[PDB]
């Protein structure tokens, strides 16, 4: 569905005929369609569509509930593979925080007590 502008917003044209948007609630103007907040990715890493990748299929069973089918590997799983993938990203970053922090603290405990070997 094509959203209408939010209440208080108005589409306008500048002296050159370029479209811009007027926000009457905040008495401001913008080149940015305020509907872009819902339809454009937030960053270059974001993706608005949640559609599953090639070969994956959402499925349902009255006892198990929602689950997922991977036609690529001929397997099924309960966990959302999108969530799984994100968490494996997250886990790799967190593992590094822990490893790096431990390394840095060990390096500093050594550097210190070279003058406190005593």
């Amino acid at each position: 569905f094509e959203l209408p502008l939010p209440e208080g917003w108005e589409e306008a044209r500048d002296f050159d005929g370029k479209v811009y948007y007027i926000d009457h609630r905040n008495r401001t103007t913008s080149w940015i369609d305020p509907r872009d907040r819902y339809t454009k990715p937030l960053t270059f890493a974001d993706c608005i569509s949640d559609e599953l990748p090639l070969g994956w299929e959402e499925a349902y069973d009255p006892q198990v509930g929602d689950y997922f089918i991977d036609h690529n590997t001929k397997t099924t799983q309960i966990e959302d593979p999108r969530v799984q993938w994100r968490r494996e990203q997250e886990h790799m970053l967190k593992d590094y925080l822990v490893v790096a922090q431990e390394a840095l603290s060990a390096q500093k405990e050594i550097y210190q007590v070279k003058q406190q070997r005593l």
């Binding site: 306008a12 500048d14 002296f15 811009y20 007027i22 008495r27 401001t28 103007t29 913008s30 080149w31």
Partner: peptide, 15 residues
């Protein structure tokens, strides 16, 4: 950058 940033019209332009 070689193109200058163009700001939108101020609030309250002619209708």
């Amino acid at each position: 950058q070689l193109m200058r940033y163009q700001h939108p019209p101020e609030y309250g332009a002619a209708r």
